[model samples]
Target chain A: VSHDDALLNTLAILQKELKSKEQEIRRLKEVIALKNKNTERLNAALISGTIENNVLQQKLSDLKKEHSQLVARWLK
Target chain B: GNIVSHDDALLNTLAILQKELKSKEQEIRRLKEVIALKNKNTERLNAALISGTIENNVLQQKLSDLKKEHSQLVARWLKKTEKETEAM
Candidate 1:
């Protein structure tokens, strides 16, 4: 009976340890979710920024071409 | 002695503890796998964030360069137009 009591105590402590480990898992999952959200936000912003940059670049190209044509006409 | 019959109760308790022990070990194994997978995902997300930061920095630099180029071109065009008007 004494051995049984000792074993029971050991099991109780292990169960407590397991509960703490579960809590750790929950906390880590929360952190991972937050990180994933931040990464998604960053990725989306980068894409939109890239698109805007491309449009600006195309506009500038057209303007430069138009300016060259105007100068040629003026010289003639 | 009647106490000898009570040994059966003790054996039953022992059996229950053994079953509980097995269950706890299974839980530990599953939790280990879950933690491993979660850790892997965390690392991947971290790497993605780092790459995204680098790409954003480069894209911002390019945008600045383009803005400056557009301003310089417009300024030159304006000066040319003024010269042409004066020549006429």
Candidate 2:
């Protein structure tokens, strides 16, 4: 029926939209977690003085690399 | 009707799975953050202890040297007084 078509189409669109939003939210959450982790590591290094500044710089660089990859994947 | 029910069920399942996944992710984040904070605290404490130990060692050395100097000065004074007494 014509009404069924409209309903199905609406449901499909809703499903697609929900899925996209969910994926976006999930990725953002992951990125936030990663950022938090990096901050924690940096803080530990700062307090301990066991890790050099160069080590922290390397960690930050790694984190940023991962973040960029995630963003690229999400955009795709 | 059957198709509709099946679709609804599938969607429901997906929704539940998504919810559970998000919940687990949040929990993971919380646990990791706590662990990170603990590590930071530990590092801070260790550094403080090391600094304190180094300072104490330096102070102990200085005290030992001062004590030795005091003893030598006292011995010289005693010798000088003995010589004066003998002269008297």
Candidate 3:
């Protein structure tokens, strides 16, 4: 009876820790998934910015080199 | 007395689990630090990429390194947890 009481108590605490571990693992996986999605979005944003900047850079350079095309970029 | 030894077995396993939990907590800390480093590098790359600097790839390389670390940590975590489910 004495050891049974001890076993019962241990089982209760162990049960809870086991559940906590399960929950924590689930939450971590979700967090990782969300981070991956955000990275994809960030990559998309960088690509768009790169394309726009390339176009602006070419336009500004072409205008600067040719005297016939006399223009300067704004805040470039 | 026999059932009592079952308690002993469980208690032994419990000790092992506790130690594993402590080590896992440390790993989680390391994982978080790597994630933070990667995010900071991502921010750096975002700015440098927009400015047409085109010179510095160091941050990107570091980000990739952090990513591999994160991947391995996650893989290790998954295996431990699946076994935890088995234990339950």
Candidate 4:
């Protein structure tokens, strides 16, 4: 192998690398887009959950207060 | 007598291209490392949501049960009070 001209084989390896580069870029772009989309959706859902959490928290407190009030007026 | 050298520039150019191939491979290694870490962080975020929302679901269930109990007791008490008033 060393006896033969290296010029052709070196050029061949370079050509192969460039071809692989294109494929790598394409896959990377697709995954990056997919991951970013998931991030956006999860972020929005997180915000929505917080809002619902607060509303539910308040509703529970109000119910507890109303329960005790009814107990005082009727049971007592 | 001396022998003449042919295609000296071609030989040199091939060496440079050979080194460039290795450099390109190094760049590939760098990107793979970065993406691997990104995947780790992304997965953690996904897991974090489950533990967090699990607590929320439990709280909501507790509230729902309490509301139901209160309504039932109020209805029964009202019926009992009406009977007493009628007898009085």
Candidate 5:
């Protein structure tokens, strides 16, 4: 081939690379979006779990009070 | 002169293509850096979820045991009150 042919080949290679780079960027954006969704989901779950634990703690405290009252009555 | 001009044009086009390729590579590198940050966030979130789940399970177990104990105490109190009523 001639020098012009070599230049043509290089041009084609560069074009291909640019196209592939665009595709890779698109794919990475989607992955980042999915990760954001997952993070939000986990945050929600963590908040609900914390609330539930607080309620459980309150219930436990109330039960302890009742238990103590019963024991005192039993002693009397 | 015409052939030389044609070759010069091709060389100029090649230079433009090379610059464009370099720009694309820089864009790719930036994207990769963003993905790396996202990956770190995902890992941290996953760990938090796992630990929160474990804590919730432990709390549930504790609540269950306390509930059982409370019920037993209620039953005993009822029995003692009934026995006192019978005696009176």
Candidate 6:
């Protein structure tokens, strides 16, 4: 029936859009988790004092590098 | 026929999808900016912690040296005072 065709087409489009959104959400969640882990590592380093001033400065530089890379990728 | 109305409905659905995608794209951009800001803050905090630790170490060493010097001075003063007491 004509009505059936219309309903099926709508449903198909909705399913595809939902799938794409879900994939995007999954990727975002992964990045968020990674950021949290990095924060925890920094905190542990601070508490233990195992990381000296120069070492921490180097680590911060590395972090900034990674952040800029992410920004570049996102912009692209 | 329902054909015209059905076509309109499909067009509307597509438009809605496009709008939703645009909104989501904006959300993602905002999220990235937030993450970047958080990273910057972490960097600043790390620098502060490093400086504080270095200053604390320097202060601790200076305090220890002062304590040792004070004890030596007190010992010498006691010896001088004992001789004076005996002469009196």
Work out the TM-score per prediction.
0.58, 0.43, 0.51, 0.77, 0.88, 0.51
Per-residue accuracy of model 6 over B1-88 as CA lDDT, tens digit each: 4877887777777777777777777777777777787789689768966876786576556555655655565566567668878998
Clash number for candidate 2? 0
**Which one wins on DockQ?**
5
lDDT of 4 at B53: 88
Better of 1 and 2 by DockQ: 1
Off by over 4 Å in 5: B1-9
Candidate scoring better on lDDT of 3 and 6:
6
Which one wins by lDDT: 4 or 6? 4
Give candidate 3's error at residue B79 in angstroms. Answer: 79
lDDT of each prediction vs. the true structure? 0.65, 0.60, 0.62, 0.76, 0.82, 0.68
Candidate order by decreasing lDDT: 5, 4, 6, 1, 3, 2
TM-score (0 to 1) for chain B of model 6:
0.75
**Model 1, range A1-76, lDDT digits (tens) per residue?**
4545665576567667666766766676676677667657766766766666567666667766765665565455
Prediction 4 TM-score vs. true: 0.77
Candidate 4: C-alpha RMSD to true structure equals 3.7
- Per-residue accuracy of model 2 over B1-88 as CA lDDT, tens digit each: 9988977776675666567666665666676676667557666666765665565556555555655655565566668668978999
lDDT of 6 by residue, A14-64 (tens): 758767876776787677778788878777767656445445555446655
Candidate 1, residue B41: lDDT: 64
Model 6: clashing residue pairs? none
- Give every collision pair in model 1: none
* Model 3 C-alpha lDDT per residue in residues B1-88, reported as the tens digit of each score: 8877787788887787677667666666666665676678677766766565342244344445655655565566667668978999
User: A1-76 in candidate 5: lDDT tens per residue?
Assistant: 4558887788778778878887987897888788778878887987887787788888888888887887798787
Where does candidate 6 chain A have its weakest 10-residue lDDT segment? A67-76
Q: Rank the candidates by DockQ, best first.
A: 5, 4, 1, 3, 6, 2
Per-residue lDDT, model 1, residue B61, is 71
* Candidate 5 residue pairs that clash: none
